[PDB]
Design a protein around this ligand. Structure first.
Ligand SMILES: OC[C@H]1O[C@@](CO)(OC[C@@]2(O[C@H]3O[C@H](CO)[C@@H](O)[C@H](O)[C@H]3O)O[C@H](CO)[C@@H](O)[C@@H]2O)[C@@H](O)[C@@H]1O
Ligand SMILES: OC[C@H]1O[C@@](CO)(OC[C@@]2(O[C@H]3O[C@H](CO)[C@@H](O)[C@H](O)[C@H]3O)O[C@H](CO)[C@@H](O)[C@@H]2O)[C@@H](O)[C@@H]1O
Ligand SMILES: [Ca+2]
Ligand SMILES: [Ca+2]
Ligand SMILES: [Ca+2]
Ligand SMILES: [Ca+2]
Lengths: 491, 491
């Protein structure tokens, strides 16, 4: 009858998730009422507080936990193994894992157990994966045209173009309101790290790529990365960087984007920032000063190990497992991921075709894709397989488009045969890595920021590398190299 | 004979705590060898990692956990109550708690147990507490004298003075190397929030004061606070602020301070930043534009609830309790807190007068006090009572000095009769407060930095306050108000 789930949702979505049409239909379909503890900001901290305080729900929905957390909770008995529950009570999920046993391998821990229910979304594979590049660079072609400038081909062209943006008044309003270059610094889709590949090798949110000699390379200690920092520093020194880039947030970023104040900026999809217009387009991959022309691959993929865990206080394992398996029904997975049909007081992502019992995406008509999706999606455990497109649902227009942009612009320069595989380390190695990352992760971005605002990377670089080593960088690399080699060896 | 303790220490101190002279003597005296897990950066993250993974020591030394963490560990049985241990095995601590019963109340959770062993240090009381002000403002008096300027007495004087620092080349090298105004943004001793009181009410690291009407006031939604942000924004607009003030760190901060580049800066004690010299002095309390002249009280005090917890895996509670009780011996408490004597090669904070069997502070002769302290102190649970001064130990000279500065400059303008008492809330209230602070704490500083670097506080202020309310601010204050009323109803 009733289950208590903790969940994570967008602050744009309703405070009570049961107000969402998907979940209203679901309750009428399953006969299960969910009482939600719905965290719309700082989910992970508030979740951890719940776990540390012993105030556990029946399950944690849309969880997104790290492997070290996943394993610590399992060893402590906070969550339970679920492989028997899958085999007994979950025919939708069992069909997917049995059809595609590699996903089943991705879910299994070193101890042979499965502890969580994944998100699977098949959009491209290998270099052509939609996740291959997250922080795409976009440029205002309209300003290029007004200033009579060609699309820049080199990093030196980019500097000249940004100077024209800063001083040439391309909007025509007689004010220096143009922001030549902007980003949200850190991890994620709005960072500038995409341009570091123009100096060779590049960078990603893991700071980790895989060389064609099969060696894992920590990127944030490469000379090429030092050179990428000096280039951004050059833009800062020339007054080309958004004066707010190191303090502003998403809301401010898109407000300037909507007003079309950006010359060059970074995001996943321009339609979320500068909108549905032809004024902005992909910045083509640039050659560096020595002719480097490269795109570093992320280690992202259409798979997330944990979008649901079941706690040890859960009162009705069979009911819970069956509820979760309804989320892996194809029509349900598609909707939970992307939105739904037939709302009367809200725009709809889908229309339902009753004749074929299938979903068809509707045109967004200017609405930001991320905005409507986060209002109406549900998140959580689900699977979208390649065989579903054209049968269960259409492929989203924005997904089709981005896949093609990655093919056209980036794949020709993704010269690393491999990226880092999604491995599931032992608790012992997870713990060691977690201790190291507790020092390293913030430190890297802090130093990066300080070097762009000041300009002392030349005198601080070697000390920085020694700090990383003290934090345990070469043990870090050894562990990652170890799992890479194991992954290759058993392929 | 052997116990495993986790501890936190300065990165200036030896990696193995047993290299410290205090602990080498402690081992001879107690016959107990401690095997240390010593974290010198990110102690709390790495401690939490150890707890989450079940890698528990016998005890956590110098722990400093928040109340919510304490009660959560207690409820889940990570740590044990210790009141029976105190009664059965700890005559020094028992002697302290009976001569000073208010600390016993401060150690006791609402469920009637004691869960940790405190740090106690008596240096002033009430408004004269050495903790009443943490981020004191300091000003280069040499520059005032070279420029023929009077000490500023208003916020409008301060701007004029800072402008004279920026342009007037008061260090006389013909270059604009003077940094008029600098700080390390956030909580703690180097932040600038001390100046917000010149606009009435002011601010502290809790963003919480207590009005003379007995009502708790959240400071960061007051118009006074908005005016304080607008003042710092004016200094940013006039190019008066350190260009890396929101990027740099303590080491960079004190490197610039050692070079005497600062006009006005913030720290606990100038001897740690600009050194032991008369070039710098207290910045007197400033009158604001409307005549506001105020010092906001912090809620700090000479008491920390948890500098040691005992874990549920601890094998030898009697041995542990007696070892902890040795730390509460008066001569041992003083040394664990402040440093030691008799090191024939290294500098010493103390000499041991063996006739009187008491400690006397030594002149450091240029050495910053905090630097020798963090190399040779031990931390952990300890008590220094006011009755010890003149009997067990000298009062530190830099402490007497800071205390005199607080009386002379700040106490006349600390017009709040109360600050917020150190209450021990229920676990249910602790956990509710911690959910709200997960949202508010970072938000408050992020918006403040943003507003100083852009200039849009006036158009974002109301949305900012609605956001604070969405995060639960009124619930936050009602809880804080309940405990304050309950406190006053009991004294
Ligand atoms: O390019 C569209 C295509 O990309 C995918 C990749 O999985 O969506 C990811 C994308 O969505 C994420 O962010 C939104 C908004 O926060 C969130 O609602 C969603 O759950 C996320 O997966 O990220 C951008 C911007 O964040 C969104 O525009 C986009 O939906 C894929 O699902 C989609 O078809
Ligand atoms: O003013 C001297 C007087 O202040 C006290 C207050 O408790 O010390 C606080 C003070 O110590 C802290 O910081 C040092 C160095 O990081 C650390 O070793 C120590 O354990 C901390 O309590 O903080 C400043 C610097 O922040 C130090 O100069 C000073 O020691 C008191 O103990 C001392 O007598
Ligand atoms: Ca313009
Ligand atoms: Ca490297
Ligand atoms: Ca000068
Ligand atoms: Ca208020």
């Amino acid at each position: 009858k009733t289950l208590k789930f903790m969940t994570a949702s967008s602050p744009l979505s309703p405070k009570d998730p049961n107000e969402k049409l998907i979940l209203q239909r679901l309750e009428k379909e399953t006969g299960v009422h969910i009482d939600w503890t719905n965290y719309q900001s700082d989910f992970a901290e508030k979740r951890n507080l719940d776990i540390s305080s012993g105030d556990l729900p029946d399950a944690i929905h849309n969880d997104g936990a790290s492997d070290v957390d996943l394993m610590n909770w399992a060893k402590k008995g906070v969550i339970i193994p679920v492989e028997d529950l899958i085999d007994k009570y979950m025919p939708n999920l069992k069909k997917i894992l049995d059809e595609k046993p590699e996903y089943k391998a991705l879910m299994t821990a070193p101890d042979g157990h499965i502890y969580s229910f994944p998100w699977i979304e098949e959009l491209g594979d290998g270099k052509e994966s939609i996740h291959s590049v997250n922080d795409m660079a976009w440029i205002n072609k309209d300003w290029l045209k007004k200033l009579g400038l060609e699309m820049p081909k080199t990093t030196d062209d980019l500097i000249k173009v940004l100077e024209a943006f800063k001083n040439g008044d391309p909007n025509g309003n007689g004010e220096a309101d143009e922001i030549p270059f902007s980003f949200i610094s850190g991890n994620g889709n709005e960072d500038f790290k995409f341009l570091f590949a123009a100096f060779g090798i590049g960078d990603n949110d893991d700071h980790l790529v895989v060389g064609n000699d099969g060696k894992v390379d920590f990127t944030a200690d490469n000379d090429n990365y030092k050179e990428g920092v000096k280039f951004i520093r050059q833009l800062q020194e020339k007054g080309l960087i958004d004066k707010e880039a190191f303090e502003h947030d998403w809301n401010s970023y898109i407000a300037k984007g909507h007003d079309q104040k950006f010359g060059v900026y970074f995001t996943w999809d321009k339609n979320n920032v500068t909108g549905s217009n032809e004024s902005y387009d992909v910045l083509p991959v640039l050659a560096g000063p020595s002719g480097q022309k490269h795109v570093a691959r992320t280690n992202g993929m259409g798979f997330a190990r944990d979008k649901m865990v079941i706690t040890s206080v859960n009162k009705n394992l069979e009911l819970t497992a069956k509820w979760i398996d309804a989320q892996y029904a194809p029509l349900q997975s598609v909707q939970n991921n992307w939105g739904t049909y037939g709302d009367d007081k809200q725009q709809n992502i889908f229309e339902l075709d009753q004749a074929s019992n299938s979903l068809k995406h509707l045109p967004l008509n200017g609405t930001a894709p991320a905005e409507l999706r986060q209002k109406t999606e549900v998140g959580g455990p689900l699977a979208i397989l390649d065989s579903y497109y054209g049968k269960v649902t259409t492929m989203p227009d924005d997904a089709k488009w981005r896949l093609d942009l990655i093919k056209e612009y980036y794949v020709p320069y993704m010269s690393n045969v491999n990226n880092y595989p999604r491995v599931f380390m032992t608790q012992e190695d997870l713990d060691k890595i977690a201790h190291i990352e507790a020092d390293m992760n913030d430190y890297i971005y802090r130093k990066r920021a300080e070097w762009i605002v000041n300009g002392n990377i030349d005198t601080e670089w070697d000390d920085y590398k020694k700090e990383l080593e003290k934090y345990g960088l070469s043990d870090y690399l050894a562990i990652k190299q170890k799992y890479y080699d194991q992954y290759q060896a058993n392929k």
